Amino acid sequence: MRAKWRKKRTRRLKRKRRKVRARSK
Amino acid sequence: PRAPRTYSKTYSTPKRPYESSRLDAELKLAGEFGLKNKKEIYRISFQLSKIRRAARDLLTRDEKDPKRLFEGNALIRRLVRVGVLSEDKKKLDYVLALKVEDFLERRLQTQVYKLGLAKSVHHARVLITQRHIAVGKQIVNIPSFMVRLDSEKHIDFAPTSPFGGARPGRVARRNAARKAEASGE
Amino acid sequence: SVGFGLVYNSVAEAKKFEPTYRLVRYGLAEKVEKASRQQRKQKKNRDKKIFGTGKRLAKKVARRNAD
């Protein structure tokens, strides 16, 4: 865990978590 | 609904529960003055702190400032009256220099021993509490009675409660009742 | 012993001013045989119900349960 590489993993999950709310809306 | 009956605590505890310096010193005090607890030491230490801080703010004022002239000379007068502060050395610098054994000497348990009459401090406390020694003609069974330098002459065995006169005593009677019972008429 | 004392100018004028329990103590009065505290208050509240001398309800009820 380089914090930059944890970031692009998190930014991936930031998209998916706001996809699953637009999925349910 | 009534007046709240005012109460206060008469002692305080050290900030450190186990100091070798403090625990040996007080056990020396408790065996010297025949004390029961450290609470009897903590009581005097709490009296000293208020008395010491009652002069520290007074000394921070001017001198001839009349509160210091009133409260300070009244502060000395009670200490001089009780025997803690001597008949010489009457100043606010010398109420700060007071210590625990100054007050402990003025206890009735100490003075019943200091004025003859007790042959221990551990026999002094079991004379006082056992309804012997009177101070005026008043029977005192309090060991921290704190004799006040004018009562010392009249400290004596009580008019009642033998060692003071007029009656034998409880187990003295029953022995003499038994000694009369077993011997004869 | 220390107390507080009174000597009145006459025995009858003692009896005017002195409280009753002191006079009960000395033989100069008898404690009244009133009923108890709650029994008085219970009897007072039962008698708050009736409006008047109650002889009329006494004769009406004794008429009604007789027949």
């Binding site: - | 056990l27 020396k28 408790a30 065996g31 004390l35 029961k36 551990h122 | -």
Partner: protein, 60 residues
């Protein structure tokens, strides 16, 4: 944090501790007379002064 360890062994050591009773002794005094008995045993009738003072000397 496995939540299901064996519970059959609870109180094992206390049960297989052999019961040895407290020995009946003459009583010790209370309050002022015990602070008197501490005064002799630390400042009047003390003898062993090893290091500074040892109130519980273990047998060597």
């Amino acid at each position: 944090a496995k939540v299901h360890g064996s519970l059959a062994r609870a109180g094992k050591v206390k049960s297989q501790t052999p019961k040895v009773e407290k020995t009946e002794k003459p009583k010790k005094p209370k309050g002022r007379a015990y602070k008197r008995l501490l005064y002799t045993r630390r400042f009047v009738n003390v003898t062993l002064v090893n290091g500074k003072r040892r109130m519980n000397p273990g047998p060597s």
